[PDB]
């Protein structure tokens, strides 16, 4: 191992830090893991496959142009460089090392592809064709896009894209499962909640949030219970940003938002896969929960869950640690197959009023093949109507007492549509025993005489059966 000689590597503070305020990537590199043999694809507005810092790692097999239906994902050039987003993401994962150009990718020996799919009508079929591309060749998919971050949208994958996610994790990588890495959202200033985004909220995606250089919650950051972990990204004007490849064969030091966080996570995951190619899609999420560090990340809502892990709605389980990920991957025993336990809670619709609480004691399918004693994800599938959606706040409390915020108030969301069988997801009770009393809390956070009705509450538990912790 030799540290990279690239001109901008020193400006890659999130990799080259000696402050002990970084992603601990060098420790992985020195263990001999640089992403060799791993294939990552950027689903975005294209990839400049001829970029001096990408050409060497470019993989046409990991690439396709879904918008124009050809094998060439080259970005469409315009005056204002609108289609630069994919190229910037790609360099974070796999910019070439030691070539005297720009900086380096987290997995600088990985192969990198791009799917051009945002530069056209983004239909359900377009999404499905991107998520489902060459899944026995592409290991990891990085997506830094989603529903509008205006703080009033509720939207997720339609039927074909949902089907592609499931096929991905069921069939991808010879059955080990495609790894889908997602940016959690940039709606912070609109107080958006990333549980209103069905891509980030999916159990099939690893949703990644951002932290600023000084360890703060960035202005653009969305809080929610579905986020799994965090990587560094851009912050205030006094804080450094992300250094990566730009359109027209340039180098930028100004890459920003959660779009910068998801690819750094994909690169760390690529290192991790090289250390253990047998890891399943669920193995990868376990490793993230086990190794991510709260330390030096500042938030107002750090809480200890039922198995003693610190969790935040801003950061999930905290900062990814490349060294720790790879170290644990090497000795990781694959987890048992996923079980899914479904519990219908309501016998009658419930008036919501100022505060509604619904309590149910569950056995988590005791005595059945889908019995779960060790939780992974949990969903509350809710159907409700309300006069002003954004004034609702919704919490879910596990039997071991872990309180997940399924929805915080969204001041811009004045919709009258309520929620139609919407699955709110939490990662915060991972590894807890889910048997016992769950509590759903729904409250009107406004003084106004708001009103409505909860007509369905389905509790969905995912996990395995195992020993006592």
């Amino acid at each position: 191992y030799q540290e990279p000689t690239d001109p901008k590597f020193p400006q890659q503070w999130y990799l080259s830090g000696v402050t002990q305020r970084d992603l601990n990537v060098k420790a992985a590199w020195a263990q001999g893991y640089t992403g060799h043999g791993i294939v990552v694809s950027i689903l975005d507005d294209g990839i400049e496959k001829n970029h001096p810092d990408l050409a060497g790692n470019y993989d046409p097999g990991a690439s396709f142009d879904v918008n124009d239906q050809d094998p060439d994902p080259q970005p469409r050039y315009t005056q204002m460089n609108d289609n630069r987003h994919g190229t910037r993401c790609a360099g974070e994962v796999a910019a070439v090392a030691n070539n005297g150009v720009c900086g380096v990718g987290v997995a600088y020996n990985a192969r990198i592809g791009g799917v051009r799919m945002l530069d056209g009508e983004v239909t359900d079929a377009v999404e499905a064709r991107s998520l489902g591309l060459n899944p026995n060749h592409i290991h990891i998919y990085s997506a830094s896009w989603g529903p509008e971050d205006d703080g009033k949208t509720v939207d997720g994958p339609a039927r074909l894209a949902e089907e592609a996610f499931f096929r991905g994790v069921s069939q991808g990588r010879g059955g080990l499962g495609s790894i889908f890495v997602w940016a959690s959202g940039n709606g912070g200033r609109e107080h958006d909640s990333c549980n209103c985004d069905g891509y980030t909220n999916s159990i099939y995606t690893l949703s990644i949030s951002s932290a600023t250089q000084f360890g703060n919650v960035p202005w653009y950051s969305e809080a929610c219970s579905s986020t799994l972990a965090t990587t560094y990204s851009s912050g205030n004007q006094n804080e450094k940003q992300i250094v990566t490849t730009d359109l027209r064969q340039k180098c930028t030091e100004s890459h920003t938002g959660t779009s910068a966080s998801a690819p750094l996570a994909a690169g760390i995951i690529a290192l991790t896969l090289e250390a253990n190619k047998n890891l399943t899609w669920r193995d990868m999420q376990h490793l993230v929960v086990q190794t991510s560090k709260p330390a030096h990340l500042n938030a107002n809502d750090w809480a200890t869950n039922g198995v003693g892990r610190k969790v935040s709605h801003s950061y999930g389980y905290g900062l990814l640690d490349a060294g720790a990920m790879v170290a644990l991957a090497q000795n990781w025993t694959t987890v048992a197959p996923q079980r899914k336990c479904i519990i219908d809670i309501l016998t009658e619709p419930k008036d919501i009023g100022k505060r509604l609480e619904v309590r149910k004691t569950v056995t988590a399918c005791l005595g059945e093949p889908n019995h779960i004693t060790r939780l992974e994800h949990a969903q509350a599938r809710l159907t409700l109507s309300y006069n002003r959606r954004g004034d609702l706040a919704i919490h879910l409390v596990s039997p071991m007492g872990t309180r997940s915020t399924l929805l915080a108030a969204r001041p811009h969301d004045y919709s009258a549509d309520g929620f139609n069988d919407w699955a709110f997801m939490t990662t915060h009770s991972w590894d807890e025993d889910p048997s016992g009393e769950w509590v759903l809390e729904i409250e009107n956070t406004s003084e106004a005489n708001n009103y409505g009705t909860l007509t369905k509450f389905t509790l969905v538990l995912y996990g395995t059966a195992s020993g006592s912790l």
Partner: nanobody, 115 residues
Framework: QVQLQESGGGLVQPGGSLTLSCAAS????????MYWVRQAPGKGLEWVSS????????DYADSVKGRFTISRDNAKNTLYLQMNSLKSEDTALYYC??????????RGQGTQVTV
């Protein structure tokens, strides 16, 4: 048993007026907000109007604003929808419910209105 029964539907000349009724039985009517939703031929469900339990707050879809009036009589266990200046666009089966996405018995069988 829980029952919501809609009435007052029928044929009306465009620009006309109808008053819809919904009688409730089998549960405490005053325990729930109430909703009018409609389904038009070959179209998805559309929320029309809503009212809280005592009737002191009311809401309307943009398409019916200024034309419809929702009200309820809790003593008489009945919900109403007064419709004015009806258009062809208003032709649908009209449903009474305790929730926008409720299903029977918590949503009614409906009453057809035709313009």
């Amino acid at each position: 048993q829980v029952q919501l029964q809609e009435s007052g539907g029928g044929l009306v000349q465009p620009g006309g007026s109808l008053t819809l009724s919904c009688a409730a039985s089998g549960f405490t009517f005053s325990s729930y907000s109430m909703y009018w939703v409609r389904q038009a031929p070959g179209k998805g469900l559309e929320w029309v109007s809503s009212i809280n339990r005592v009737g002191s707050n009311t809401d309307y879809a943009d398409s019916v604003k200024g034309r419809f009036t929702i009200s309820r009589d809790n003593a008489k266990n009945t919900l109403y929808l007064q419709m004015n200046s009806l258009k062809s666009e208003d032709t649908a089966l009209y449903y009474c419910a305790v929730g926008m996405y409720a299903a029977p018995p918590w949503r009614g069988q409906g009453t057809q209105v035709t313009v």
